[PDB]
Amino acid sequence: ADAQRSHYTVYPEKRWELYHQLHSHFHDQVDHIIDNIEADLKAEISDLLYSETTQKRRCFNTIFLLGSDSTTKIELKDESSRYNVLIELTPKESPNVRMMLRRSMYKLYSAADAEEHDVSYDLSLVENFKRLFGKDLAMVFNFKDVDSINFNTLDNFIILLKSAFKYDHVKISLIFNINTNLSNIEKNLRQSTIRLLKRNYHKLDVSSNKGFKYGNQIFQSFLDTVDGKLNLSDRFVEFILSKMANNTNHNLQLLTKMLDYSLMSYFFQNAFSVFIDPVNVDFLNDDYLKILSRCPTFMFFVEGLIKQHAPADEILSLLTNKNRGLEEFFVEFLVRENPINGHAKFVARFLEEELNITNFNLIELYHNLLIGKLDSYLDRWSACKEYKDRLHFEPIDTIFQELFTLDNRSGLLTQSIFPSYKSNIEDNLLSWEQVLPLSGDLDKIMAPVLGQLFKLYREANMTINIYDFYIAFRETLPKEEILNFIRKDPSNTKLLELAETPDAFDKVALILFMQAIFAFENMGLIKFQSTKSYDLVEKCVWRG
């Protein structure tokens, strides 16, 4: 009723608590690491912004922050008897030379009155700032996304700032937050201005992924938060190797996402999650005792039991013939610490400072541990050759770990996080039987509306004719069902006069065809080439 008006508002667990004591505790380790790099980035700009006393003293100091994410915020020193202001210029606010000046002079001016306790918004204020506001000026220019701007505007901008170098009560500082590709930037500008730039440049790198000093760190703080109460399987962690390698800019926010979603999967379906604290042994039930039986390492050890002990009268008794000894057989292996966690923490600090190696990934270090490829892991520096015997660990085939583990053995978080998008749509439209289970008898003898043309839509050419496609569409519809369908309702009258018309079938097809190809434009599957002609269209969607 109201849906054509836009944005109308209206004003209409024993398991989960053990998640709640684990989740936030992990997240205290997350954000405390997040402010560490936040304090790191804010520090290394601040000292380098100051103490650089050049001899010519007629040049601005420039700073190239390579690899930076265009969101790096900056704080400034107080530095009394001089105001220090920050101006940010987003490529959305870069239309010309003119408004790049005019908005920027406006942005400092309100920042100037707020600390001060009619004028014109150009460089007139810059010289008279000594008289307009008393103390001197040191402005800084947070160019947020520098490679999207037309550089001749930027090149003409910096010559305008070059004229401000003759007043001696103002200091200029430029911050170039590039995304990447410093060699691209010295190509675009005028070479007369690069020689203006090259007085005191500083190529500080700011990257979230820099030698994995935080990537290996945040996975390490993940491991102790789940220490001894779970495991991480091999097929799980290689997914974390492969998919996180596909995102260069921000691994660290992504590793929080795919790990915490993985932990959300475990608490939501696994019944033995309650038993990670041994105080919960009183919650034991036969239904819990029944579902413990189908563990693969459980039944395999029983196959190991019979072949080792060909007397099986003991093994048959400890089966479901007893239940007290049966769970006592389980809680024998309950407290398995699995020191692969601790052995990782043993070797992680070692090569960090004993051999002092930094170009390493702790996750595949954990993964090569899971197969036994730690020997073929340390080889890539040839520096643990004196230490491959003391850092050695053979991964033991541990038992009952399949109840306390995380793995994408179901393809869940492969699907629900990285969905094969146009694959799952195209699979939905060719098949349609595994999505959908008086008038439903028609449905068992006639396809749904969107999908029935789709099989011929595959079987059509690159650019297709509209009418012959409908002519082919009329072939798929048999005649007797529609007149059985159009005459199904005796209650309505306005439909029934159309129902008795002898050309109703050929009219109801073009009505139904012009509801489906009407609905293949908002999906972008078919594009109407050369409007006001629309005799032929173009299909972009291919199967792959």
Add this chain to the structure above:
Amino acid sequence: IKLFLSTDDNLSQTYDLSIISKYLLIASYICSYLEPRYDASIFSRKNPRYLQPSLFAIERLLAIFQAIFPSLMKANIEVFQNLSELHTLKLIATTMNKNIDYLSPKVRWKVNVPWEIIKEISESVHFNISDYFSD
């Protein structure tokens, strides 16, 4: 002597982008010379090196991308991720204004990277490109 024969005004990157995005770049350079009349014959599943680049459309990328990748891949969510990642790097830009380019109206695309940075990034992923450029 050493300073008097060099300029020393330039303050060649191996580029930061990932592997599937690297092959995403290596398919985009192909339509600087490969016209639609020739490409589907020479890239079956069964010179303008100097000249200014031609104009893309969408899905011609994935036409070439699916061919030249090492059935081994089908999920294209991260492939769609690195496109607008490459759009923010201004290495492939829109012909029109920078606004409506998402929904498939008439939007043409084009590379903005010279040949040498393509040539290093070909060997950086061990892929051979100079075969398919033939005057």
Add this chain to the structure above:
Amino acid sequence: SLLVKKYCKMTTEEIIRLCNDFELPREVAYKIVDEYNINASRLVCPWQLVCGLVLNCTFIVFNERRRKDPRIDHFIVSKMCSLMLTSKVDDVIECVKLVKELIIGEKWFRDLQIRYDDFRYDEIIFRKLGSMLQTTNILVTDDQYNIWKKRIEMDLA
């Protein structure tokens, strides 16, 4: 290598020989003749198409035993690798993956799945839906475990 000796006609007597040994019912046994007659016109190689269709229906008509016995899945393909005298099992699976998408745009298989009620259905509507309560096959399922249990413990005692 009879499969690579191409361009030979499988007549009406010949094709019903090829399906009465694999125990096909009369519903599909006429349909194989019906869709070969569809594909006798637009073919490329007659040996490859005639075997690719007979495997996936036996994958779907015998799945009440195939999902309940994993060993017979090699049995049905190897008895055709001996019948068609193939090279190995490498090329035959390359056929059945090929023609499966080539029959996914037709009518009768979308009937034959929902007529046979065979699939399992409630898994796929929970797998494709992205359900957190879907089955994770790190486990062996309770039925197959009980199939494993009653086979072994009666072998035991």
Add this chain to the structure above:
Amino acid sequence: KSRHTMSMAPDVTREEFSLVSNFFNENFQKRPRQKLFEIQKKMFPQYWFELTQGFSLLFYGVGSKRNFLEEFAIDYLSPKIAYSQLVNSIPCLILNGYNPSCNYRDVFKEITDLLVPAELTRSETKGNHVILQIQKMIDFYKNQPLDIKLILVVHNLDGPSIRKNTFQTMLSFLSVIRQIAIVASTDHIYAPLLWDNMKAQNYNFVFHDISNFEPSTVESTFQDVMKMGAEGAKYVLQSLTVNSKKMYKLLIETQMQNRGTQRTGVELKLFNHLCAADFIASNEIALRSMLREFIEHKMANITKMEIIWVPYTYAELEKLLKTVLN
């Protein structure tokens, strides 16, 4: 190039189309549609639990999802979360993305009023301060007690106004805040072209399939095809003078005496004499003035004999003959 064309189709009027369309979309596949709707209903507790983690939930899939979102957001979730925190329930702010009249200023002016005006945020209202005003909203919200106070819905996120790039980045900064849950749906096949690793870092999207093969009743309204001129001038002739019917009847006869193209047309002089023959046209001016009315509503064409020809098809003019002229 003998092509069958949409002009050569048995056409259907306005009331005839929409009624029989309404018959199908409410009686075609009704039983399996709610049968799907009961199956996906068990996923509703799973969405409630993940949404406490501030996850931007995104729904893809074929078919319209508009009915499904409004059941899931309004009736199910929004009172369930208010009961589980402990009074009016949680305010729902939908965004109709299929409505092209959505701007960035107006919806955010709703947002800061939907959110708390604890400070004088109109002081920071200054000239694009929108990203400025939301940045002062974000850092304050980093140190607040974690509870959802608002859930917003964005239908058809690839819509004609929401897909604009200055609006997209605006929603990106909203999603990093923990106090608001972002449940949106798109329909495009190229929807993941919209986001890079910068925005999805702010978004942390997760995905779920919903495919009910809905007809998109509301979403078909703004869209148009040639159903929505031969049909345009079909109504003007129903309200004119009675003489214009006759002088168009004499026009349409000899213009269909010979598709309706240029070559079947007639010269101006003889047509003046022909409409002088039936005591209709006095002269050229009285002919042309009530022929400019057929020109002003683009009901006839002229090219060069001095050929005036009707731009409608061969099939259309005899339909115009036997129905409205007769």
